[PDB]
Amino acid sequence: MFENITTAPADPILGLADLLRADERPGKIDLGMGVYNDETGKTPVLTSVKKAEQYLLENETTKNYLGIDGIPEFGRCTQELLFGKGSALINDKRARTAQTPGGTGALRVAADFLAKNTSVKRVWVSNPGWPTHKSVFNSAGLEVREYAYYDAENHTLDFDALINSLNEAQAGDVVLFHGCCHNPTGIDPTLEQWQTLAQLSVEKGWLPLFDFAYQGFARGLEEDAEGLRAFAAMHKELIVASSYSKNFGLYNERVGACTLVAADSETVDRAFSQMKAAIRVNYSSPPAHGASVVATILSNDALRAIWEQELTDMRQRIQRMRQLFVNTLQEKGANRDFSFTIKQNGMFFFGGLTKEQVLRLREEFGVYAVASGRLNVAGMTPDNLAPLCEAIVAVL
Amino acid sequence: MFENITTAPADPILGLADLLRADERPGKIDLGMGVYNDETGKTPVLTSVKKAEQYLLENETTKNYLGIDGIPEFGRCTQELLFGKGSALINDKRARTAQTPGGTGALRVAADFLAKNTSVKRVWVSNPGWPTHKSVFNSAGLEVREYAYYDAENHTLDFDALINSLNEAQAGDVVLFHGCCHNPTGIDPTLEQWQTLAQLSVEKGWLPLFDFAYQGFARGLEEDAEGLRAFAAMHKELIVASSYSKNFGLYNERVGACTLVAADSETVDRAFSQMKAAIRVNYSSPPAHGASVVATILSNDALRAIWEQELTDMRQRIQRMRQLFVNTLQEKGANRDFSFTIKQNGMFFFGGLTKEQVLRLREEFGVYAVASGRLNVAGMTPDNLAPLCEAIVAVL
Numbered sequence: 001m002f003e004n005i006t007t008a009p010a011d012p013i014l015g016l017a018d019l020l021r022a023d024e025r026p027g028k029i030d031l032g033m034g035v036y037n038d039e040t041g042k043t044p045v046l047t048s049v050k051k052a053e054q055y056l057l058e059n060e061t062t063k064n065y066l067g068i069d070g071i072p073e074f075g076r077c078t079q080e081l082l083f084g085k086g087s088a089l090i091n092d093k094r095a096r097t098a099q100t101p102g103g104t105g106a107l108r109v110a111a112d113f114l115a116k117n118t119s120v121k122r123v124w125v126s127n128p129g130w131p132t133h134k135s136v137f138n139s140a141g142l143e144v145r146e147y148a149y150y151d152a153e154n155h156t157l158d159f160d161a162l163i164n165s166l167n168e169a170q171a172g173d174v175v176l177f178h179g180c181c182h183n184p185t186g187i188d189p190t191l192e193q194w195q196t197l198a199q200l201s202v203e204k205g206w207l208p209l210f211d212f213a214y215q216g217f218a219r220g221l222e223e224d225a226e227g228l229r230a231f232a233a234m235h236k237e238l239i240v241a242s243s244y245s246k247n248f249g250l251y252n253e254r255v256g257a258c259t260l261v262a263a264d265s266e267t268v269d270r271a272f273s274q275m276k277a278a279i280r281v282n283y284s285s286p287p288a289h290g291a292s293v294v295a296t297i298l299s300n301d302a303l304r305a306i307w308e309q310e311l312t313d314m315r316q317r318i319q320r321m322r323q324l325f326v327n328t329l330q331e332k333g334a335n336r337d338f339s340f341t342i343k344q345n346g347m348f349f350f351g352g353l354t355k356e357q358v359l360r361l362r363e364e365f366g367v368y369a370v371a372s373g374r375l376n377v378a379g380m381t382p383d384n385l386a387p388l389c390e391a392i393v394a395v396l
Numbered sequence: 397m398f399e400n401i402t403t404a405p406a407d408p409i410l411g412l413a414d415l416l417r418a419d420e421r422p423g424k425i426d427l428g429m430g431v432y433n434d435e436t437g438k439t440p441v442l443t444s445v446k447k448a449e450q451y452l453l454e455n456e457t458t459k460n461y462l463g464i465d466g467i468p469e470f471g472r473c474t475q476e477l478l479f480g481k482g483s484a485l486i487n488d489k490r491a492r493t494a495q496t497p498g499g500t501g502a503l504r505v506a507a508d509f510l511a512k513n514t515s516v517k518r519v520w521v522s523n524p525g526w527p528t529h530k531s532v533f534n535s536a537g538l539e540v541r542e543y544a545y546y547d548a549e550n551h552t553l554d555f556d557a558l559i560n561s562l563n564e565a566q567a568g569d570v571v572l573f574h575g576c577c578h579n580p581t582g583i584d585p586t587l588e589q590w591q592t593l594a595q596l597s598v599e600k601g602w603l604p605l606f607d608f609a610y611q612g613f614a615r616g617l618e619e620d621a622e623g624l625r626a627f628a629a630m631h632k633e634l635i636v637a638s639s640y641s642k643n644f645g646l647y648n649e650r651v652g653a654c655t656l657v658a659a660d661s662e663t664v665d666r667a668f669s670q671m672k673a674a675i676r677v678n679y680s681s682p683p684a685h686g687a688s689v690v691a692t693i694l695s696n697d698a699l700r701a702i703w704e705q706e707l708t709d710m711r712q713r714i715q716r717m718r719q720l721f722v723n724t725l726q727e728k729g730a731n732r733d734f735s736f737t738i739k740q741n742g743m744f745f746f747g748g749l750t751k752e753q754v755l756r757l758r759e760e761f762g763v764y765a766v767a768s769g770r771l772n773v774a775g776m777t778p779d780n781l782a783p784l785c786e787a788i789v790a791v792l
């Protein structure tokens with residue numbers, strides 16, 4: 001049965017882990033996957049998380065199955081975090097949230113739900129964008145079309161090209177937006193642009209799908225959700241795939257959510273029943289630990305305060321590394337200006353390297369990055385910064 | 397987009413949870429889902445599990461992503477538990493295991509892997525059987541055919557009908573077997589029958605797929621795997637979807653595994669790369685907590701000893717309830733003999749009620765069971781046994 005199976009192509013992002021494994025050189029620098037590192041180059045468990053796990057260890061009395069949609073408190077807290085404490089969507093009961101195994105899992109559930117219960121045939125994703133998006137939607141049998149987004153020469157959001165590109169999108173099509181911290185450009189729409197996009201979306205009849213994996217990494221928790229809330233204020237229907245992998249440092253516990261929004265309570269409930277059916281034939285019910293940690297923290301004033309501060313510190317360290325990176329490049333002799341990286345929100349640096357330069361950095365300097373030229377700024381520390389820049393200056 | 401979505405049909409098993417929720421009557425007895433209960437009617441966290449979680453809370457230093465296939469130690473321990481400490485499959489490196497979100501998740505990964513990378517068109521499942529099997533395989537685009545298995549009149553495995561039924565199965569077809577504790581009959585093949593089935597399977601050219609969710613609940617950990625090992629000794633290829641939900645009481649942490657076996661190391665690796673691709677576009681990587689607990693326990697002699705004893709106690713309590721159930725039915729006036737339930741392995745009791753009787757038990761007595769007439773013996777306690785039997789005697 002398996003004699004003719006062909007080897008699968010390596011994943012451009014997740015595949016870096018395997019290459020790093022094989023490389024036995026001592027000075028390897030991992031700037032591939034979007035994972036936060038502290039000044040010591042480690043990816044620690046948040047303190048607020050440790051305290052939540054301590055609490056669970058002492059008060060948890062059973063591991064009995066959660067409902068198909070997960071922990072109810074988790075859903076409410078996720079909705080508040082997304083739409084705002086007193087949002088009308090929450091009051092009118094127009095939203096239903098299902099706990100999922102990570103943001104990627106949320107995207108899969110959304111894709112299966114769409115393919116089987118709606119007339120959606122196309123999903124529009126940005127270019128440049130996150131490769132996993134095409135893979136997930138394609139695996140569900142939906143076609144992916146790309147829309148322009150980045151002005152590679154000026155390092156800004158090419159709004160005109162974006163609008164012009166989406167005009168080929170027909171009503172009933174799904175258009176995917178990154179809530180904040182666009183992966184990989186790091187350039188997000190301004191509030192006014194978000195408002196124009198929401199407006200346009202309503203007229204064209206698109207079904208907006210927001211991938212929200214970095215809430216809190218651009219400017220703040222509430223600020224990062226203004227784009228989404230702008231859309232939520234005008235749309236009757238929408239979908240949100242969010243993740244707690246990064247803002248909680250719960251990467252391997254797979255904590256995400258898929259939120260469905262309909263015109264009214266009656267409609268979202270009927271639709272959500274089908275979303276639950278898509279989960280039922282996938283993994284049945286979600287893993288409790290990670291989501292439990294998130295629910296516990298967001299529900300406890302004390303823990304939540306500690307957590308928000310830790311998030312703030314993470315965002316701030318990355319912002320400081322961007323300056324140090326740019327500065328160190330200038331005093332190391334870089335024959336090019338990489339100051340535009342200061343405007344980029346999120347964990348990454350993008351737009352200054354070719355795939356060959358990335359390949360040379362790996363083979364000759366042991367510096368690992370995505371072939372697209374995306375480097376994880378969150379992986380830079382005061383210790384690896386010097387050798388990292390020396391390697392870069394050597395390939396420019 | 398969602399105006400015309402139709403409400404989804406309730407799940408015959410998972411749907412009981414919602415009905416129980418709505419029923420406000422005080423004396424409700426939940427005998428639906430297969431979850432273990434102790435004498436007090438609670439589903440506790442195993443002591444060995446609590447100790448493992450204590451250990452993780454103190455030694456875990458990061459929540460960084462696991463590889464697509466999960467924790468490596470978890471895979472090795474799962475293989476040893478399945479094939480035996482010094483199995484040839486392990487020595488020859490013919491097996492690859494991917495940690496999955498539960499046994500159901502394992503089945504989904506196997507189904508997606510099969511549909512996309514092989515010529516498999518049909519999957520054969522038993523009748524009676526577990527409804528979720530058809531749902532999962534059908535959702536992947538594979539057709540499900542049923543094979544006879546139970547002698548409803550004698551309450552035994554109808555081997556002749558089984559063989560005769562599978563003769564319509566062509567080479568290249570997938571045939572699904574329950575490793576032990578057949579759900580819901582509780583009647584498993586004898587070692588000799590397993591050997592005849594393995595033999596037959598090799599000649600017909602079937603691809604065996606074992607659903608192993610109750611290892612340790614029939615007779616013991618090693619004994620329950622003899623059927624599987626019988627097949628593993630003669631087949632070049634096979635698939636195993638196992639679960640730790642029950643034998644570890646880790647239901648909501650979603651701990652399962654999908655093991656792939658090929659003729660040689662070279663072939664399993666190539667095939668496994670495609671299985672990883674199927675996971676990549678689903679949930680990306682598995683939840684660490686649950687599998688970590690399992691790896692920790694199976695790797696620590698002390699913890700493992702405690703765990704094996706707890707498993708032994710669970711199997712023993714269920715066995716004692718079967719006797720008490722049968723006895724209490726006789727002294728309560730049952731006009732029928734339910735002694736055949738003593739031979740049934742696992743958590744359930746099956747074969748003595750009609751769907752109407754089950755419906756009446758619910759509506760009039762607040763006793764909840766699956767419409768198929770399957771009751772969770774593991775849910776019976778010395779306290780609810782009397783009223784439970786009184787209700788049953790009233791509907792016979």
Ligand SMILES: *Cc1c(COP(=O)(O)O)cnc(C)c1O
Nearest residue numbers: 102103104130183211213243245
């Ligand atoms: C990190 C990320 C996700 C979700 O990650 P999970 O690990 O699955 O929670 C989704 N979309 C983008 C663009 C991301 O960068």
Ligand SMILES: *Cc1c(COP(=O)(O)O)cnc(C)c1O
Nearest residue numbers: 498499500526579607609639641
């Ligand atoms: C319980 C069970 C499973 C797996 O359950 P999970 O909760 O997904 O781990 C698989 N097959 C059968 C027949 C089962 O009874």
